[PDB]
Structures are given as structure tokens and as C-alpha cells.
């Protein structure tokens, strides 16, 4: 049910992140590294929510509303925000690890100067991971393989998987589990578990199915039906709704954000 599902997942998802940005910028300035570190992925999600109607056009049977927009740089810009947001999320995980596990030397990287240089690094690496897509952006819209000949499309996505999940969301965003190792009012253990397990579980439950199915698509492109057009749409819907779960989770679980929300 794309006509309703896309609207439902793109209205609340795009509104919650904007509200989170507004509160985190106005109610609580919080120059703290962590505030702009989470604002980075909040803005990433805000500008990445626009891909939902673009992919829903596939089920809407309108390949482009204008004609050059959908294939020239849509996969080169909206898709770049995926790597941007994953990089910002692992940046937040590293920030938390440095703030809690080891402020032994927190004046070298935890300063606000580095908090924006790391964000700029994340943006430029996301652009570089999406620049080949723009260079090969010419199809009927997905075009990473049509433009080259042999297997560059498969090479792209393998690199995309290895750079989007293997490094940042498997062993780098797993630093949340390592944060509690020795520091986990004994109820504080469960109180912080209800925030350290849920984020990793959401990232590994709503976002993995997209990469797992397409790598299967790489293996075998199964025949289609309303089952395929509906459930492969649900898979990308879950991948998009991870970006809706992240802002609300971050803005509600944090006690400072709870005070910031109540400000």
C-alpha cells in the first residue's frame, strides 16, 4: 500500500527530525560536542527523508515528475545522505565513548573545533562514496551499472555495503556496547541499558534488511508479483523508518533532551 505507506512514513519522519533540530538548537543551546554531533545526523535525516516519494514513484509508475531530476543526481544526493547519517551516528558513538570511557585526554578531539571537522569529513566521504554514482548517473532511476560494462554495479554496491554497514554499524556503532563494560542506584544499569541496547537493535533491525535483500538481489533477482512490489517496498520502508526511529529515540531517551524537550 504505497499511496498511504509513503505518506505515513514521510510525514511524521520528516516532521520529527525538524522538531528535534528546532528544540536542540533553541531550547538547549548546549555547545557541547554531542549536541552538534547529533544535529549532524538529524540534518542528514531531514534532507534524506525526501527520497521516500522518489522511490514511491517506482510503484506510482511515474519514472520522473520533471524528467532530468530523478536520474541525474537523485541517487547521487539522497543516497549520499545514507552514508552521511551512518557516519554521523558512528561519530556520535565515538563521541560518547570518548566522553564516558576515557576523558583522560578529552582536550585533543572532544573540543568543539573537531566536532565540526569530523562532520565535514563525514559529508565529504559520503560525497566521495556517491560521486561514482553521479558520474554513471544515466538510465531510463538506478544507473551505477548501466553506464559501465562488466561488473562495476556489483562492485559499487559491494563497496556500499562494506562502507555503510560493515565498518560503521557493525564494529564502530558497537562501541555503545563497549561503553558500559565497566561503568554499568543500581537501577541506573537498566536505565542506561534501555538506551544502549535499543539504538543498536533499531540500527540492526530496520536498516539491515535493505542491504541483505539487495545483496541477495546481487545473488538472484527473484521474479516479481504484488508480493515483491509490496514487500520489497516494505523493506525500503523499514530502511527509511530507521531514520524516523533515530531522532525520536535520541531526543526522548536522553535526560538532557528530556529537560530540553520540557524547556
Amino acid at each position: 500500500l504505497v499511496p498511504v505507506l509513503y505518506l505515513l512514513v514521510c510525514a511524521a519522519g520528516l516532521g520529527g527530525n525538524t522538531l528535534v533540530i528546532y528544540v536542540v538548537l533553541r531550547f538547549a543551546k548546549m555547545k557541547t560536542v554531542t549536541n552538534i554531533y547529533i544535529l549532524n545526523l538529524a540534518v542528514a535525516d531531514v534532507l534524506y527523508m525526501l527520497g521516500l516519494p522518489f522511490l514511491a514513484t517506482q510503484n506510482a509508475a511515474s519514472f520522473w515528475p520533471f524528467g532530468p531530476v530523478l536520474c541525474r543526481l537523485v541517487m547521487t544526493l539522497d543516497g549520499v545522505n545514507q552514508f552521511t547519517s551512518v557516519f554521523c551516528l558512528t561519530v556520535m558513538s565515538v563521541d560518547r565513548y570518548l566522553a564516558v570511557v576515557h576523558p583522560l585526554s578529552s582536550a585533543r578531539w572532544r573540543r568543539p573545533r573537531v566536532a565540526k571537522l569530523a562532520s565535514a569529513a563525514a559529508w565529504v566521504l559520503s560525497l566521495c562514496m556517491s560521486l561514482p554514482l553521479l558520474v554513471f548517473a544515466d538510465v531510463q532511476c538506478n544507473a551505477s551499472w548501466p553506464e559501465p560494462v562488466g561488473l562495476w554495479g556489483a562492485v559499487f554496491i559491494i563497496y556500499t555495503a562494506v562502507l555503510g554497514f560493515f565498518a560503521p554499524l557493525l564494529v564502530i556503532c558497537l562501541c555503545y556496547l563497549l561503553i558500559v563494560v565497566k561503568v554499568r542506584r543500581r537501577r541506573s544499569e537498566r536505565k542506561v541499558t534501555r538506551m544502549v541496547l535499543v539504538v543498536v537493535l533499531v540500527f540492526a533491525g530496520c536498516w539491515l534488511p535493505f542491504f541483505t535483500v539487495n545483496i541477495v538481489n546481487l545473488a538472484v533477482a527473484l521474479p516479481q508479483e504484488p508480493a515483491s512490489a509490496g514487500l520489497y517496498f516494505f523493506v525500503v520502508i523499514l530502511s527509511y523508518a530507521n531514520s524516523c526511529a533515530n531522532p525520536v529515540l535520541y531526543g526522548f531517551l536522553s535526560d538532557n533532551f528530556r529537560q530540553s524537550f520540557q524547556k
Binding site: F54, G79, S144, N217, A221, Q224
Partner: peptide, 6 residues
């Protein structure tokens, strides 16, 4: 069947 569509 590739990027975001099939």
C-alpha cells in the same frame, strides 16, 4: 532490481 527500485 538494483538501487532503490526494480
Amino acid at each position: 532490481c538494483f538501487x532503490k527500485t526494480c
